[PDB]
Amino acid sequence: REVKLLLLGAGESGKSTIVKQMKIIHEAGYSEEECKQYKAVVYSNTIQSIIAIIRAMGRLKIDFGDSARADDARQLFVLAGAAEEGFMTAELAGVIKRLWKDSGVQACFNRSREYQLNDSAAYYLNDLDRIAQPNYIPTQQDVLRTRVKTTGIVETHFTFKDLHFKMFDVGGQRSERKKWIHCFEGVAAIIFCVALSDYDLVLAEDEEMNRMHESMKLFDSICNNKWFTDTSIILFLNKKDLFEEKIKKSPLTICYQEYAGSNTYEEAAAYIQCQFEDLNKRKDTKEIYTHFTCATDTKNVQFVFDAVTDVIIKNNLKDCGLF
Numbered sequence: 001r002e003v004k005l006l007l008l009g010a011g012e013s014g015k016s017t018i019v020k021q022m023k024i025i026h027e028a029g030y031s032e033e034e035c036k037q038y039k040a041v042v043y044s045n046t047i048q049s050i051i052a053i054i055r056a057m058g059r060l061k062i063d064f065g066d067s068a069r070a071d072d073a074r075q076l077f078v079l080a081g082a083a084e085e086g087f088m089t090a091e092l093a094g095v096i097k098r099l100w101k102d103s104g105v106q107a108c109f110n111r112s113r114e115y116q117l118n119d120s121a122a123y124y125l126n127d128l129d130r131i132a133q134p135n136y137i138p139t140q141q142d143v144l145r146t147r148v149k150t151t152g153i154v155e156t157h158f159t160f161k162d163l164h165f166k167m168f169d170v171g172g173q174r175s176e177r178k179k180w181i182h183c184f185e186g187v188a189a190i191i192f193c194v195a196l197s198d199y200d201l202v203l204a205e206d207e208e209m210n211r212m213h214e215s216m217k218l219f220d221s222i223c224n225n226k227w228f229t230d231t232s233i234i235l236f237l238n239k240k241d242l243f244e245e246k247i248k249k250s251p252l253t254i255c256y257q258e259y260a261g262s263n264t265y266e267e268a269a270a271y272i273q274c275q276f277e278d279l280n281k282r283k284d285t286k287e288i289y290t291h292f293t294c295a296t297d298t299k300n301v302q303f304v305f306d307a308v309t310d311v312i313i314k315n316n317l318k319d320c321g322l323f
């Protein structure tokens with residue numbers, strides 16, 4: 001059953017968006033006794049999260065959207081003490097709900113790139129109701145969401161077609177890329193997200209650099225890698241949706257000057273999928289398994305995922321292939 005997809009890709013590839021999608025389309029958890037032990041940890045980190053989003057409202061000027069949000073915030077420090085016990089009185093529950101919903105607290109979390117946020121601070125508050133329920137048991141995902149920053153590798157469990165997946169997000173930015181070896185073990189198939197819109201955008205790592213050309217480079221290092229020969233490679237041209245818009249104005253020539261093709265979503269987006277697959281040293285014996293995708297659209301990540309899963313079955317099985 002264990003697939004364990006890896007999420008590789010250039011920065012801003014949208015790999016993070018793919019992670020949240022699994023929470024929606026899929027829902028699984030099977031370790032109820034183990035989860036109860038964690039229950040203190042879940043309620044704990046959640047209070048630590050919104051408190052971050054709150055104090056950031058000070059150091060960055062940000063008023064609460066509604067005047068009413070005053071007093072609810074002050075209360076949070078009081079009821080929060082019970083949350084350390086792993087208990088959640090409903091009064092603690094709604095008080096948090098009013099804050100995260102706020103038009104102004106949302107002003108902070110968009111800003112979150114500056115102040116440190118808890119790793120899970122979104123995933124928890126977004127589902128704050130389900131955790132609130134009496135004698136709540138953490139989902140098997142909830143346990144993984146636990147802990148202070150350190151591992152640098154987000155975990156995400158979900159069971160599709162009765163097989164347990166373990167997606168492992170890793171930051172696209174070059175600083176994060178060195179971390180990637182930790183996830184290499186036990187992988188079934190890689191998804192290599194790549195933003196088609198990047199064709200004009202420059203990396204934050206280097207404004208001179210073309211973001212797309214950067215994707216072509218590290219992608220070669222992975223697909224060619226001897227370690228991955230056993231593992232399926234599956235390209236994921238992310239953000240096909242916004243790309244059809246931006247192409248209408250900007251020429252593709254901003255990335256591949258040689259290009260002649262029309263400003264159409266087909267000739268344009270498809271042209272990249274040509275240049276990428278060409279990198280393969282082993283076209284004779286290795287299939288790229290490309291798939292256009294739109295992480296922002298849950299409807300599109302879903303039907304596509306159904307196809308990719310089938311390839312994992314017929315191809316991958318039993319202790320990383322051999323026996």
